[PDB]
Amino acid sequence: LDRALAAITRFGENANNVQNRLGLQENALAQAGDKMARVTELAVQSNNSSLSPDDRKAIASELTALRDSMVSLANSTDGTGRYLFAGTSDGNAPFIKSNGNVLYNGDQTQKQVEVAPDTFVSDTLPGSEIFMRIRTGDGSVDAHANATNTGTGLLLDFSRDASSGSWNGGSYSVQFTAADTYEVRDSTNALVSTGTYKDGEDINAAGVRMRISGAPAVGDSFQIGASGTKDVFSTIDDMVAALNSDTQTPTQKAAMINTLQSSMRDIAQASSKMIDARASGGAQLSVIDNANSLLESNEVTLKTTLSSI
């Protein structure tokens, strides 16, 4: 009897504890989702290349405030002051500022909480899985205008492309040998193909594709390869720093817009990760309800057994 009663007491406490934490997580991430939606909107506006330096600086200012509030939300606690987004190292704040970057000092472990016999409900997400471990580009491939380009070539978009072959995961460089001519080269600087450039026409090779507009100069290049991972705070920081740049020449404007288009892509990926994280938090709420109703059936059996004896 004593072992059975301890079990149900434990189930009741476990259910209440995980229910609280999951509720505070939904609140925190709802708030973070609103901020993330405003960051997304500002990223879209940042890609309006007609904005004044003054308009850009306003957007940069707001993005900085949003980034800071996101850090505070990432350090949310549960009302025993245990951190929500630190995994199992929930005693010290998991998101810490170092040299203009945000570091994650929590762990990767998501706790499973027994709410009924053999029936587990996940506790809150480790912060790494909301804020840090975010793929760039389109999630699969990423591409950038080279930082040293002297022309006005915009990288408008890119993707995997089943038409030019099955992409092997490798990196490639599209390099202009003339105003209207490019070469595509692999990791080893070896020639894969050449092509004629026309504004907005797809450049296709090696299982990947890109679209370029404007006027690339001879020697300008564009790199394309596997996506990396970048935390959302760095993505916002890099967008802010780009917006604050001077754009006196067509070349400088093109450099900023390339950087801002890339930031926006990476932001789109961070937005998708937040959607998913938020959604995951609701998925097991019916099991908590079921655990709670089973516990109500236990009240009825306890009360009748108590009355009998």
Residue numbers in the entry: 54 to 362
Sentences from the paper on this structure:
To initiate filament growth, three junction proteins, namely, FlgK (hook-associated protein 1), FlgL (hook-associated protein 3), and the cap protein FliD (hook-associated protein 2), are sequentially placed at the distal end of the hook. The FlgL and FlgK junction proteins that are located between the FlgE hook and the flagellin filament are indispensable for the formation of the flagellum because both FlgL-deficient bacteria and FlgK-deficient bacteria lack functional flagella and are immotile. To investigate the role of FlgL in hook-filament assembly, we have determined the crystal structures of FlgL from gram-positive Bacillus cereus (bcFlgL) and gram-negative Xanthomonas campestris (xcFlgL). The bcFlgL and xcFlgL structures revealed that the D1 domain of FlgL forms a four-segment structure, irrespective of the bacterial species.
Crystal structures for the truncated bcFlgL and xcFlgL proteins (residues 45–251 and residues 48–364, respectively), which lack ~45 N-terminal residues and ~35 C-terminal residues, were solved by multiwavelength anomalous diffraction (MAD) phasing and single-wavelength anomalous diffraction (SAD) phasing, respectively. The bcFlgL structure was refined to 2.2 Å resolution. xcFlgL was crystallized in two different crystal forms, and we obtained two xcFlgL structures (xcFlgLC2 structure in space group C2 at 1.9 Å resolution; xcFlgLH3 structure in space group H3 at 2.2 Å resolution; xcFlgL structure refers to xcFlgLC2 unless specified). The truncated bcFlgL and xcFlgL proteins adopt one-domain (D1) and two-domain (D1-D2) structures, respectively. xcFlgL contains an additional domain, D2, compared to bcFlgL. In the xcFlgL structure, the α3 helix is split into the α3a and α3b helices, between which the D2 domain is inserted, extending from the middle of the S3 segment. The D2 domain of xcFlgL forms a β-sandwich structure, which consists of a β5-β12-β7-β8-β9 sheet and a β6-β11-β10 sheet. In the xcFlgL structure, the β-sandwich fold of the D2 domain is affixed to the upper part of the helical structure of the D1 domain. The β5 and β6 strands of the D2 domain, which constitute one edge of the β-sandwich, interact with the N-terminal region of the α4a helix from the D1 domain. Notably, the D1-D2 interdomain orientation and interface are essentially identical in the two crystal structures of xcFlgL (xcFlgLC2 and xcFlgLH3) despite different crystal contacts, suggesting that the D1-D2 orientation would not change in different environments and would be recapitulated both in solution and in the flagellum. Our comparative analysis of the two xcFlgL structures (xcFlgLC2 and xcFlgLH3) indicates that the N-terminal and C-terminal regions of the FlgL D1 domain adopt diverse conformations, as observed for flagellin. In the xcFlgLC2 structure, the α4b helix runs downwards as one α-helix.
